[PDB]
Design a protein around this ligand. Structure first.
Ligand SMILES: *Cc1c(COP(=O)(O)O)cnc(C)c1O
Ligand SMILES: *Cc1c(COP(=O)(O)O)cnc(C)c1O
Lengths: 405, 405
């Protein structure tokens, strides 16, 4: 940076602390990643100056010839990446992507069936303090109490009983592959639309390491950040038949002017994801997650569903007589960043929890491999088995520092 | 830029075209501006990597110590700038700022009273194709057919007849000062909340050149871009008594993770607006608008309301037997960027219109002054009085080039 340090020392000092923090800590929060310098440069461009309400070649304002090129690059690359017939790259966030799909197919008070929020469903899949649960009548399907895999017979039963207009599949804390074919079969049986929210797994889908929801879902929503490793924002994919309605839902439906600079950054990220090296990266993400899961089990930890098929895992801390909140706090003391997370059938409140959620996307981006996964698991073992020993915590601290340099 | 040119030649080439376009054209679209290099650097920072759902000191995830500093700088600077008791700097856009306020105080189907969309009201103030007009029952007040000033007796009558829960004041195409005291008096009479959407005029309010809605409104919404000259995004201001509800409306109500890098950019912009030179800038904006209005009248143009109190003006093109669409198109041919705009009581559709809207914020940022306003008016006169003369259009083209260099 050149101009910010002189113009705003306060903001610059804080950004610099954050930058240094990102390097020093071991980031295991499953939603986190580190974007490329190219992605950041795109977001820091003069495209923030341009109003471009509407769509490429169909804008309200003149002078959009070049931002049109940018948006089309984003849409076309997204379509090639996911094999979708239509992309809308304007959503400000994953929340707004979902909001737009809901706005497209639902009326106020319509019934929607989504994943139980305590079992892995997202806030925007029917929380009573979120617009989704306030605006629509959400009902929930669960995972099996033993296997922790989605109970597809429960999905089916809930769908048949409640007759939802929309079924939502996808999760923010589900460590196994989701069967989109079964979701579509159930949707078809009850005459419901299927929406898949692939935000967490989008990078894996792009790399062919998780089944693609595009052929099975009427609508696919996602964040551009997370495993896809893009700028912070949202996206909707759908077949040509819903394109006009989806576009109208985003604008003039729920948003105003799009963030053209962020859309440029989206194009950059999609360009990156189309490359062979991203496929290699995504495989290392999944490989690292399996390795970390196995190494954690070696330490004596119990994992929700007994492991992982993707980038994330959930530790059930009940055997160690620890809450997620306690584990989160002590790991923070040694420089390991996790979040407490409700586990399926958690006896604890969302404010306390019986679990921690862990993902490998961020550490993989930093170049961590299998050996580092073993060490991370060993450090977590050292910490959580010795929460009362400042000796042990200092050793963990030094071992964390050794990993990040 | 260093990394984008090598990583993504396609995106870079398009950005470079846009950058060059921004320099070459005379930007008169009233919503447009040019942000500082410091603001852009902040948006292009590593803060995009951080999930920070919640609020400073009350986040869901750990590691937010530094982004907390950034958000607090934004909130505190906003409060000093506007004399507000509370700020929420998380809204992704002006649309989302409004969405959040609506979500806070209204239930589905509640009546809201806003400015007639054909008279200057915004899309998000009740368009039947926008969430506002779909989710809530919007009724409208108008401007006087002759003076084109808001008819406060009409505001009052509509409020008393329809009994709205919420009254919205503020506009995207109103060239005169809005009387927030009268709006609050009417709101008080009918027991309605008052929301002021100051997006267009926020920079002028900050500089003390338009009366401040903060003391009169329960809620003030705004874009951080436009006259305030910040990054693309939104903000809500309110008294302490609504702070908790407003914060909850933004998250977990309507959004997910905030854009921390954009929030950094917001802090930077607010820092800039607090400086004496921004006050001088904003005065030049208003001075330039008056000068341009006067010079356009000298050319024989009729202006809606007979002039301007702010950064923007509306040309009523009926005396020249031109539509807004025609004027917009021909001005585009010579390098002057305006938008067609419905005028009050327009006999034409929104797709055609009888007016063009013009604002001086962008050209003022470029350093244009009174002499340039005279020349801009003269060029517009030359063009619109000679739409059929390629000679005249080429002369205009050369005169536009002379202004931008
Ligand atoms: C992260 C996420 C979201 C929300 O994205 P934001 O950008 O935080 O609004 C929605 N759905 C799922 C499944 C997610 O993982
Ligand atoms: C520009 C504007 C908006 C919308 O802002 P976006 O950032 O485009 O969503 C809302 N209200 C008013 C009065 C505006 O001027």
């Amino acid at each position: 940076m050149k101009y910010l340090p002189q113009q705003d020392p306060q903001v610059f000092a804080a950004i610099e602390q954050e930058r240094k923090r990102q390097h020093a800590k071991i980031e295991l929060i499953a939603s986190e990643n580190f974007v490329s310098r190219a992605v950041m440069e795109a977001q820091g461009s003069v495209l923030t100056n341009k109003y471009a309400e509407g769509y490429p070649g169909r804008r309200y304002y003149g002078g959009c010839e070049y931002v049109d090129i940018v948006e089309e690059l984003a849409r076309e690359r997204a379509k090639q990446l996911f094999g979708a017939e239509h992309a809308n790259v304007q959503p400000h966030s994953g929340a707004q992507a979902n909001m737009a799909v809901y706005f497209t197919v639902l009326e106020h008070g319509d019934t929607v069936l989504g994943m139980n929020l305590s079992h892995g469903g997202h806030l925007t899949h029917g929380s009573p303090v979120n617009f989704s649960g306030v605006q629509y009548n959400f009902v929930a399907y669960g995972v099996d109490p033993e296997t922790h895999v989605i109970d597809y017979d429960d999905v089916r039963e809930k769908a048949r009983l409640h007759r939802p207009k929309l079924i939502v599949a996808a999760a923010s804390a589900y460590p196994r592959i989701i069967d989109f074919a079964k979701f579509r079969e159930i949707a078809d049986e009850v005459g419901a639309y299927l929406m898949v929210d692939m935000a967490h797994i989008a990078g894996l889908v792009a790399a062919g390491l998780h089944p693609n929801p595009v052929p099975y879902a009427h609508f696919v929503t996602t964040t551009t950040h997370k495993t896809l490793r893009g700028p912070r924002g949202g996206m909707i994919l759908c077949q040509e038949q819903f394109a006009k309605q989806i576009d109208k839902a985003i604008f003039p439906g729920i948003q105003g002017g799009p963030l053209m600079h962020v859309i440029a950054a989206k194009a950059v990220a999609f360009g990156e994801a189309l490359q062979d090296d991203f496929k290699a990266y995504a495989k290392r993400v999944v490989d690292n997650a399996k390795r970390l899961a196995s190494a954690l089990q070696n330490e004596g930890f119990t994992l929700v569903s007994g492991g992982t098929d993707n980038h994330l895992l959930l530790v059930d801390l009940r055997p160690q007589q620890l809450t997620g909140k306690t584990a989160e706090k002590v790991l923070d003391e040694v420089g390991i960043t996790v979040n407490k997370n409700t586990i399926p059938y958690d006896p604890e409140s969302p404010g306390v929890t019986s679990g921690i959620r862990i993902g490998t996307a961020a550490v993989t981006t930093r170049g961590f491999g299998l050996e580092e996964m073993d060490e991370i698991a060993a450090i977590i073992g050292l910490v959580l088995k010795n929460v009362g020993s400042e000796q042990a915590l200092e050793e963990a601290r030094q071992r964390v520092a050794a990993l990040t340099d």
